[PDB]
Every structure is written in C-alpha cells, then in structure tokens.
Amino acid sequence: FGPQPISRLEQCGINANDVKKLEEAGFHTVEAVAYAPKKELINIKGISEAKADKILAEAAKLVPMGFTTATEFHQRRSEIIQITTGSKELDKLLQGGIETGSITEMFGEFRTGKTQICHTLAVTCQLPIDRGGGEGKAMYIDTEGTFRPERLLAVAERYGLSGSDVLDNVAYARAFNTDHQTQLLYQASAMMVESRYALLIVDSATALYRTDYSGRGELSARQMHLARFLRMLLRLADEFGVAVVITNQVVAQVDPKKPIGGNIIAHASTTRLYLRKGRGETRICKIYDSPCLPEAEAMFAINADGVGDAKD
Amino acid sequence: FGPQPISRLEQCGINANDVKKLEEAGFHTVEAVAYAPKKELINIKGISEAKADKILAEAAKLVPMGFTTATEFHQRRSEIIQITTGSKELDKLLQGGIETGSITEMFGEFRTGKTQICHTLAVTCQLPIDRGGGEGKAMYIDTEGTFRPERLLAVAERYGLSGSDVLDNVAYARAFNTDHQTQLLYQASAMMVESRYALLIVDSATALYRTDYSGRGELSARQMHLARFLRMLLRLADEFGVAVVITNQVVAQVDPKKPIGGNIIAHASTTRLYLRKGRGETRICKIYDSPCLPEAEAMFAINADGVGDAKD
C-alpha cells in the first residue's frame, strides 16, 4: 500500500486545474507528483510560479529528509520482499531471489529459453508471501510476442495453484513500435494505481529497439530515447515498489558470447543475471555484477513443469 | 478476415494526403497504420504535428489495451489454426504442426532436401480446415530458384486435390539482389491485402544474403539490413496473421554440423526446426528450442509423393 492514493493532497490548488494536471499524461501517484522536476512541472499548461511551489511544498512526502535516516534503511531494506526462483540452486545464486524496487535484467543468448525463464516467474509472483510469492497481479509486456500461456499453465500444476485463477491474475501486451514502448508504460502507471500489481516482465525490452531505429550512427538519439524509457521504469519502481525484470539480447563483439544489447545506458542499479546454455537439456546462469554477491555462477535445467533443479 | 480493410478509417484527414500516405510505400492495412512508429510516420512527406496524432489516435485498433486481456489470450491463442506436416511423426514432433502468426525457420544442411520439404507444405496449405489445411492462397518466394512445380504436382495426387486448381492457388518469385528481397516483401503486403493468402515459404531467406554482401567484416551492416527485413516479416505476421516459414543454411564452425547461417539477429520468437540427413532414403528433423516442447527429435523419409512417414 505504498502509493499515497494518487492525489491524496486535499488542497494546494486541487481545484480542477491540478486534478487536470494529474488527469494529464503526468503521473498521478503521490510519489510521481513529488518526484518530478520543475522542467516537467512546467512541462504542460500549469502556472509555473504558484503551481510548482504549491505542489512541491504540499506533498512533503519527505522527500526532504533525504540524507536523513542513517542506517534506518537497514530497518526498512530488510522488510523488502524478494521473489522466488524455483530452482533451489537458482535461489542460492540469487541469495534471496529476484528483488522488487530494482530494475533487474537477464543478458540471454539464442536458444537459451530466457523468454521461457522469465514467463515462469510470472507465475511464482502469484504465490503467498510464505510460499515465496508476492500475492500481486502481474505485468508481462512482451515485444517479441514470445508468450505461451500454455507453458504458464504447466507452472500452475507444479506449484499447486488454480489454473484459471492464476491466468486471470497476470496480463499481457504485444507492443510493436519503439515509441509504443514508451507509451505503454504510462497506462501501466494507470493500471498500477487501481490495484496492487506485483512483478513485471517487460520482455525483451531491448528487442523492439534493436532494429526499427538503429540505422547505423543516428544512434545518439536511440540511446537517448532508451534512457527516457529506462528512467521511467525506475520512476515506476519507486512509485509502486514493483519488481521490474526486463529481458536483454547479447549481440556479438567481432574483433566469444557478447555484451548485453546496445551497451552504455544500461546503468549500474539494474542488477543483471546472464544465462549460457549447456550440456543436453541443462542451461547455466551466472550473475554478472550487482551488489548482491560481488560475483558467482550455477547450473539448472528447463523442465516441462518449469525451470528447475539440476535433477534429471 | 484479420485486416480492418486497409484505410477503414473514414476520416482523421483521410482526404487525399492520408490516402497518398497509404498509397505510398507505407503499409496500407489498419494494423500497419497503427503499428508504425512516429519516426516512420514522419518518415515521408506528411505534417508531423497534425498527422501523427490524428492517425495514431484515430486507429484505436486497441493497440491501447496492450497490457490488458489477462489470460484472454488463452481464449484466443487456442483459435490460431496450425498447419499440417504430412508425416504423422513430423506432426507429433511439431505438436500441432507449423504455426501461423509466428515466423518459423528450418536449419538445413546440403543434400537434406529442406528445399523439397518446404515445397511440400505449400500444397497442404491449400487443404480444408478439417483436413489440416489453411484454405488460403500461398507465397513461396525462392531465392535459390529451388522451385519444382512438378514435385508439387505429386503432392496433389497424394492429398486428392485438383491439380491445376492447386497450382493456381500458390505463386512464386526468383528474386536475386539482397535489396530486391526487402523490395519484394512490400508488394506482398499489397498482394496480401487483396485476398486471404495463408502460408508462406520464403526459401532460403538467408541464402541470397550469404554472399552478395558479406565481404568479410563490413558485416555490421549486413546483420543490420537482415534485421530490417526480418522485422518487416514480423510486421507481415501481425498484418495478415499468415504463416511465415523461412529456410536457413548451416555454416560450419571450424574450431560437427553447424550454427544456423549468419547467427545473432535470428531472434528468439521465430521457432526453429533443424533437418539432419541419415540412413538410406530417410532423413531426421529435431526441433531446436521454440516454446512448443522445451526440446525433442524424430525421423521420417522423403517419398516420391511427398515428405512422409518412416514406413518403407
């Protein structure tokens, strides 16, 4: 119950114009109103002197304390609920599972079923707190259309959940245009408002971008636009405190495997887990740096009833 | 009857310029108009402020719902009609046949008659819904010119269909230039508009590319151009919801068999089935990962009257 009910603010010019400001593309949550810069406050059809101060001062979501709260975060950070891999080995290498309030990626190759791996968690997300789940509704928002509800139905059987219930609990977009990607997120923001939505697979986030822009070296701007989309996801992170696990594509360096797709503005915070497919049905997935464990490795195999333990 | 009749939109500036926008290289289907990014909307001689908003807003093909429709896809995906191999074994390994609305490939070697195997389905495509067919007219658009209508005529006899009718139902291009490949697709788009065309063998799609470009290491750009062509095929996928089965060439790794021809931008979604020719007349064809079955194998032999069952 993170959000301070969108425009919880009673006043500070809450009369129609401010409500229209929220009713605009502008994010509606308390956090959004508060987090925003003045550029953005004066971005769209509101009176800059009065509005900014009023809105900014008014929220006092604190926000202000900022550099306050020395090792109080330790009392908090501990409380952050960390999701469940479904390989015992996987979870050990994750050291507490894939985590909410971080944008966490996977550096996959071809054939490596990272598509497959991601779709699986989107089921565990549904499970109770004590069974390693987030007891929330769930975003997989796919740009390849790598989406098989059929495979997800198998996961239900494995983890003892009512099929039709589980499928109804998480919801999905094919969204082709590079601009559409940006667009989609804003309405998620709206969708996030209405109930507790828990964990999110944009998949792959890079893939719609790979092509359909990147005509050689008019790329300065490509990488600019990704930023915007990437910052928004971090905005989405703070707002609702939802897990964002975003899928990448490695693209060869021919001077093997490769760097994760499109390089530099994939920023430090987004914690990144790379999958490298191996002997027989087994596949191996070895965390590149996050803060977690400074590094580490570990295999596992995809199983008809979900990505699981190295057992045959 | 997927397409919303090209420019179904009555207005939103439909006056001559918009019609000329569609009458341009720009795709004409409702989906095309809607799917496109603004880069592309502002790609060619239209006024960016007015046009984009008008066209984009107007379509409302929804499009917008995107992350909506939680396990509603299950009600839909089920309805997707999945084509017929003609080896009972083949179909069992396919677990419902080669599927429409996906770009599905085959990783063939030399002598492996994958050329042959592909031409066969292009007949079953013609068959009624209940006999495993798609009741659609059909694209084989070959760059090797590996095209024998004679062999296809044999398939008719096997599957009890009127010869001259069947041959008239599917149609073919030799198209030599790497640029011609891209070009050809756009007019298909036009050809797709005019009637229900069902399943498509571009064959081999890589082969015209293999040479006639790839002068060593000015390949960054080779792999770029393939992308464009590959994205367009996925665009063609959404548009008409037609099966795209694209044929590859294996190319040795001398460090056996081999990786499918030109590597990385062959993307996860395109589901890939590899053929490996074997004892006597028999040949074996063992699905590399798609979502279908996480993996699995199975032989079969080419028979004078089509690719068939392992029976002698």
Add this chain to the structure above:
Amino acid sequence: FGPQPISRLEQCGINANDVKKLEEAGFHTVEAVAYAPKKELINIKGISEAKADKILAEAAKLVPMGFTTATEFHQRRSEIIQITTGSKELDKLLQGGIETGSITEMFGEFRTGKTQICHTLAVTCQLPIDRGGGEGKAMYIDTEGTFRPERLLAVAERYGLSGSDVLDNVAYARAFNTDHQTQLLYQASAMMVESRYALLIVDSATALYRTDYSGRGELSARQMHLARFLRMLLRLADEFGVAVVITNQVVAQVDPKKPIGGNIIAHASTTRLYLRKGRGETRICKIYDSPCLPEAEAMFAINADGVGDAKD
C-alpha cells in the same frame, strides 16, 4: 571546528533582518556569509546599500589577506587529513588517500563496482585519525539508489568496528529530480552546521543528469545548471572542509572506453581516478591527472569484506 559558528557576528545589523537573511535559503556559516558575491547578497529581500557593506565589512574572516601568506599554506596544507583506501596498493597510487577540501571524482564503466568502491570508504571515514579515518559522520547521497547497507556492514567486520554504531554514524538519500539534487545540497549545508560531518559520497552525481534533461541540444543550459550545483559543492568544500567524492558515468565516443559523462564543465579542481575492470575478480584503477603524481596506474580486487589487495 572550521565553521565560525554560523552567525558568529554579534552585531553588524544582526537585528532580526540579518538573522532572517541567514534564516533564508542563504548559507548560514561564517564562510558562506563572507564568500558570497553581492549579486547574491542583493539576490533576496535585503537593503542593498546598508546590507552589503555591513555584512561584507563585518565578516573580516580575512578573506582579505588572500594574496598574503606566501608558503604559509605549506604549514597548513600539510595539516589537511587525507582519508584511507583499504587497498595498500590503492593508497600508494592515491599517495595519501582520497583528500578532504577537494571535490574528488571516479570515471567508472558498467560492472566496474565504483558504486561498491565508493560505499566502502564511507565506512573508513568513521575510523580514528591514527587508523586512517576522519572521525566524522557521513553523507552518501545516492541518485541511482545503488545503496547496500548490508555490504557496508561487511566493512565493519573487516575494520573491527561496532556495527550498529557505524551504520548510525553515516546517512542517505535517494533523490530523483535534477532540481532535487540542487535542493538536497542546501539542507546538507544545514545538516553540516549542526555537527562535524567528514566525508561525502554523492553517487553518481552525473547519473540523475544523464537523462531527465538532456534532450539533445537544449544542453547549453543543462551544462549551466550542473555548474551551479558543482560550484555549490565547492562552496560546501570551503565551508566545512569536508571530503566530496562524486561518482561519474563514462559515455562512449563512437567516432575504446569513454570520457567522463557530460564533458567540459567537469573542472580542473575535482581530482579524478578512473576504474577499468579486468581479469577475473580483479579490477584496475588508474588516476587521470590531478596535481598529486602527474599520472600513474595499479590493480586490486573487490573482496567480499571490502575493496582490497591484489591477494587471492
């Protein structure tokens, strides 16, 4: 005990208005009152004739001597207490550690754990003068939220300090808006007044700026605003004489690795150490020019209990 107790000035119009002038956004320390330009003195709601003269003349913090004190600085500069790296090698390359009364930066790539490296010192800062510490409370004020108190707790074990005490000693902000960055600093200024706060990791200082402004070439002004923020940090430097270590992001030059993020107005004063990650767990960090040693290099590896020595 650098600060002359904010408004140490007994008179010089200290009656209510001057106190309100200090009680304003305007910095409160003796140094702030003194250092300020008249533009800024006449910036906010004071009488320009009387106020300026009174305040300016009154401080006489000397200030005035300026070009005085020929190599007396040598008697002083020597006394400046210089913090402790925790790699013996690191400290040798630093030639006395990361230094207070300078804004010192680190030019990091992805995966290079500079995030990690910075969080570590924020512990040594706590240590006694003789053990290489600053015996002060500490600012890490993070914009990525790259903050793991958990990892910091490990540092305590390594350097034999009471866990809960150490964590209570240093304090942290996630602060998203580009304008918020500027805002946060002013209250630090207030927080700096109240006790001896010793060393400061703004982290990364560039990263909130990377995006969320820099829409192409309305950038002249971006770089202006950074200046302001950067000058304030130098203002903060003189005031309390506290170490400012600010983390950067390298941003590729595609005409490798890269220039530090956002170019020109990163000024000469900020002494800069760039980290370049290497063989296995090891990482190498090779001082770009400051005055220190005109250049030089040196590796080291991250160790579960802190960034440390080349030992296995």
